[PDB]
């Protein structure tokens, strides 16, 4: 904003938002896949207990 008008700043900020929103989707998808693995391990540990 400091060095650009709104008409063009909306486009530049929208690009950054899309990029960082993709970062969050990658993060959350991997946590779900990895949480299933620790859950399977907790099920094995409970069964052995």
């Amino acid at each position: 904003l400091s060095r650009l008008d709104p008409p063009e700043a909306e486009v530049q900020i929208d690009r950054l938002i899309t990029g960082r929103l993709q970062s969050l989707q990658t993060y959350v998808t991997q946590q779900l896949i990895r949480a299933a693995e620790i859950r399977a391990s907790a099920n094995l540990a409970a069964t052995k207990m």
């Binding site: 008008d5 709104p6 008409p7 063009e8 909306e10």
Partner: protein, 48 residues
């Protein structure tokens, strides 16, 4: 439908646009970026 109308100089027609900066778009007629209208501008010589 809002019809706005005025006269401007010859090398000023490019300033009538969403998101611009100039001596006529600063504080005389600021067109917002939610602009769904249409700017018509034609040469007016001899009448004006």
């Amino acid at each position: 439908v809002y019809a706005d109308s005025f006269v401007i100089r010859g090398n000023e027609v490019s300033q009538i646009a969403p998101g611009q900066t100039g001596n006529i778009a600063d504080y005389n007629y600021k067109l917002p970026d939610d602009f769904t209208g249409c700017v018509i501008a034609w040469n007016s010589n001899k009448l004006d």
